[PDB]
Subunit: 389 residues, 4 copies
């Protein structure tokens, strides 16, 4: 009876949610600027009696949607994403993610009055990163994920597969501050912020010999001075660093901090060096929770492929350090589909992409059913995760 | 006899008219090659006194040549008019005074020019502070415009009154590197790194400073150093000055900086561009007999001409001095503590002393032109001295 | 009806004569291209068994080719002898055993060679550890010395017994910069700075690392960086390595480093030299059917052939493997916890276990060559498989 | 007087004895702190004329103090003896002449010292060309050795005869980086790279040159930059000069270079050492009236004292000028085209003109000492001018 209601609702109303997906696809908004997308999803949740908190952990366009039955049972959380890319506009198919997670939440809410427990959608802006990007990183730090017990989600891809491993990433600004002087007449009175920057860059080049092969550090000079006749008192670069784990990355980023400090000391300058967004973490996978995903991926008619699909780089990792989380992919077209391409945006607004949205909503809604209904399958997952972390 | 008195009577009779022009250009500072109001205001005043006007000279829209010919034999006495402001500072070099002084000088001498013969010429010279397609006089020399005048006169407001200073040679240059972008994490091995090319160029310029002469300079900034942290740059852009005592010495220096760029390109597998954004300023060749003539009338008009080390300058009027006897002197507009390109200087350029400098300088120049036309021995001597010093 | 049995009877009856030779080479370590005792001791043993000797091969004074031809049609089976030690460690790679075992294996097969036809050849191969005019086998390949053999056999002592490993391509390079001196305080404007050129080269090499493949390496030191603080250096000298997975890839990587040097010279107005101080090592091309032959005899001789990731090597025997089917297998001389190029390894190259590994290797190689000559189908298949792969 | 004539008669009637001492030193050129033959040959001549000798001064084995004391009140007149040669060049600074002249001057004045009072002192000053524990006179000043003398006299052979030139302050510094080795192919990630530290220090010094005064210098070389290409270096070693107009300025400059090293260490994770390999050289404080006394006697002895710009020097005699009135003049030994530290200058320093200069300088210095002891008003005037000028 319980599975019937959830599927019936999603199947008779599919076109309504598919429509929300194209409406968001047509209006690509970048991270922390996704006003249309968050409102549209908030409305559908409010239309089905969800209690809405907006503006979460410093993210104006984030939300927490909640429907609580008032009965003991797990709080099953669905991660909604809805940010596009600059120039490419939804070439990661984030129109599907937010709509799929909302449709699944609302699908499950249909029976939550009966099974017990709670349903929650977390609207998570800026997953692609940037200034105050990676909202889920902020949520973990703010304690927003103490509100859920399990974090569900699906991502569109070139195939259907279980959660991939993911990497830790920092996005960092480097700034040097000196003292300007006319370069021809009195450069001996200057403290050269550009010499600091060049020296920092020489140092980062040298570092690459001595970091692990899985690690990355790359960046650009955003402000290199403005007048050729005047010694710069300010320069500004932006950098990424990347490691397999947060523990490893914290060590790696401190090495780069020290290259900046050293450059500062060489040149008599002062400096700032720090994150422009809360750091992204590696995924801690719960295999029994992906088993559950595969099971319903198959029951819904997808071939879940076992293969190396590479490493990801997503703030959903951060949520997996707190609670059992998934970040699987649903096929939305050719196996030659590559994320962040024009052909991938086209794919996210196609009939296959529309089908994946509905299949994703069904899969998640039915996992939520089994986690609240079953206490042995739920406890297996919770105990597995807490052992792996 | 009385031809000197007509010049002075004209200049002094309607001096306040010209002071107003100075103040109107001061209120509305315009940058190099953008001096629409200044050029037009000065062109209208020449046109009001029957000068034949040519506009848009040597690729400079806001440049002009204003000629009054008597139709009789004699020298062509040129007056250099400058009228560009500085960014954020707005006539902190007092160029409102220079253009107006030269116009008023030319028009003073114009009063008498039908009696004494020869020809008066105002050359409107924009963008002397430099920049993209800056230094109009450099373009003028190159285009043949300076063949129209026999002598080139000018005054420059300063912290004191002094004869022409030595000036330096300058190039202003763009360095651009061109590569092949790639995603930095995933596939940096199929990129050609234009920022690496730039850092290598910068490292090489630093090294070069050990091996250049102590009178030479090389300095610059990175205008484009990449835009996305996750993408390898395929384009970087820097802007540089190079300077030396002479144009001969500078062409050697700039070429060394060229090869530093080239080498950076070779190291990184990138391609490159390296060239001047403007024509290129030359060192002054001074004609001491011409500065003697200035000092003479500087004193007659009541200025104390100081003989001290007032440093080197760096002006496209040096380029004109390679063609014809040229002066680039200074007239006091206030405190000896006045430094050029400061807020105090801008305020000084609109004071009563700057207004007075303007009138005195016009008087000095008009009277030099009277004698250069009138006294053939004094003219011959200046022409021959200059010719010896360049030739 | 068994020529196999003569081979083993010879090696087994006078094995102690050969174990002596190994300990004599071991007591007297000689660095690459200085292996006077080793080369002569081995040459004297070959002369004792009717081998014809040519010495000084491909510009290597301590190299040789010992041939014994039956005069009958058949494959020329080559055995590689190595005999160079390391500075300070002195045979912590166990090259005392490699050269002895190959000479013993070739003399073992010589006992039967007049009957089965064909030819036995031993290539004395100095300086495999590398250095200046190092990697003798690289020179042999380039000199056409390997046209004289049809198959290249060898054994190396190791932490266990296994088949040929994959190896990597290496270049060993000199960078020299040539400028013009002047007094640094007084007239540095008349100088061309060979040290600024060097610093600029090093800065460029650092940048290169972001853009090379993860399996590749470039690393070096400054051997001459100027002598007087008050004189602008007119000369600087660095030594570098470059490494890739193939020789085709390494030629590209080394040329990138060539252009980094070249760019540095252009920046500073200096001149430059950039090139190898030794010929240059190549990736192994393995012939699995030849390693199979090894494993078959390895097991007949009592050894356990292990199949595991034993990592990558870097040896000039790879260069040989581009010309003819070649092996570079390992024979157990002690604990699995043995590491190459260490003090514990040198002691193991002269132990009872290392002695056993010599005779076992010598038997394995002699029997392999017996089969390569005798079995045309096995020979044909190994030659054709190598031919398809290269 | 009869005293003045005893002095000159001594120097003239056995000048060839001392010229031979100059040639034997020239024949056997010895580097700083290694001048065993020169110091001993000089010490033996002073021993012969009843001078008390102390050897090994302020940590310099080839240094000596040779004292002849009258036991009567009077100034203690110091004669600075130099005798170090250059590597590969022999005596291309003419130091063979310097020490012999000062010994012959000291001994000439010694003839009369028991009659006029006071004291004669020769300081044997090794390694003035510098290097490891170079510049003995820096060590002497620092050790209190110059409290033994009231005036310091000296002559230096040159292309002409002239008064003490201005001299510069110098530091010779070693830079060492300490890290942690690894196999470069395999384990680079557990290394700390002392060569990257050195490269980074050099890149930093290159950048500094834009920002040091035009009279300042910094230059060095890498003496150890690693030894095996397959191993990340755990040790590098460089040697540097820094230079400035004054010690006050040079300390600021040298500290800037220290911070460049510190920063390189911080970037690479290395440790470091930075410090001088010799006592630092200081700028000359000149006493004009002492040079006037030199010029007086130079002229008497047959020399033309030329007033002209002969550039800046760079010598540890400068250090002595901070304590007592000192001269560092030059005496002509050949063509005006002679340049120090060349083969021609070595050739000059053994020539007849060089021998003549030795005797003349000896005479000049001994006649200078006679007046300094004898004339209290000339002495006092020199002491009070030095005291004023040093501050
Ligand atoms: Zn994405
Ligand atoms: Zn995504
Ligand atoms: Zn367990
Ligand atoms: Zn200006
Ligand atoms: Zn101006
Ligand atoms: Zn080895
Ligand atoms: Zn080996
Ligand atoms: Zn010297
Ligand atoms: Zn000297």
């Amino acid at each position: 009876g319980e599975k019937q209601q959830i599927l019936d609702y999603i199947e008779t109303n599919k076109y309504s949610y598919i429509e929300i997906s194209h409406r968001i696809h047509e209006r690509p908004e970048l991270g922390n600027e996704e006003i249309f997308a968050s409102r549209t999803l908030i409305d559908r949740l409010k239309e089905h009696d969800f209690e809405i908190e907006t503006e979460i952990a410093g993210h104006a366009t984030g939300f927490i949607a909640t429907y609580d039955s008032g009965l003991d049972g797990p709080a099953i959380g669905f991660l909604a994403e809805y940010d596009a890319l600059p120039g490419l506009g939804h070439a990661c198919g984030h129109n599907i993610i937010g709509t799929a997670s909302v449709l699944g939440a609302i699908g499950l809410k249909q029976v939550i009055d009966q099974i017990g427990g709670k349903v929650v959608v977390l609207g998570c802006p800026a997953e692609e990163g940037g200034e105050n990007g990676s909202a889920k990183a902020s949520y973990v730090k703010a304690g927003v994920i103490d509100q859920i017990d399990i974090a569900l989600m699906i991502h569109p891809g070139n195939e259907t597969y279980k959660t991939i491993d993911t990497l830790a990433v920092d996005v960092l600004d480097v700034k040097f501050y000196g003292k300007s002087a006319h370069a021809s007449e009195n450069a001996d009175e200057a403290l050269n912020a550009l010499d600091a920057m060049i020296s920092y860059f020489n140092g980062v080049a040298q570092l690459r010999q001595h970091i692990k092969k899985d690690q990355r550090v790359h960046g650009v000079i955003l402000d290199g001075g403005k007048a050729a006749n005047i010694i710069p008192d300010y320069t500004h670069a932006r950098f990424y660093t990347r490691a397999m784990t947060r523990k490893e990355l914290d060590i790696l980023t401190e090495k780069v901090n020290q290259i900046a400090r050293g450059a500062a000391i060489q040149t008599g300058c002062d400096y700032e060096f720090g994150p422009i967004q809360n750091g992204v973490n590696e995924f801690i996978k719960t295999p029994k929770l992906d088993d559950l995903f595969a099971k319903y991926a198959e029951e819904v008619g997808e071939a879940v492929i076992d293969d190396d699909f590479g490493y990801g780089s997503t703030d959903t990792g951060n949520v997996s350090h707190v609670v059992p989380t998934i970040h699987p992919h649903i096929k939305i077209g050719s196996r030659n589909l590559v994320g962040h391409t024009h052909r991938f945006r086209e794919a996210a607004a196609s009939v296959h992409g529309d089908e994946a949205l509905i299949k994703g909503a069904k899969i998640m809604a039915l996992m939520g059913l089994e986690l609240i209904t079953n206490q042995d399958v739920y406890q297996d997952i919770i105990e597995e995760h807490a052992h792996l972390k």
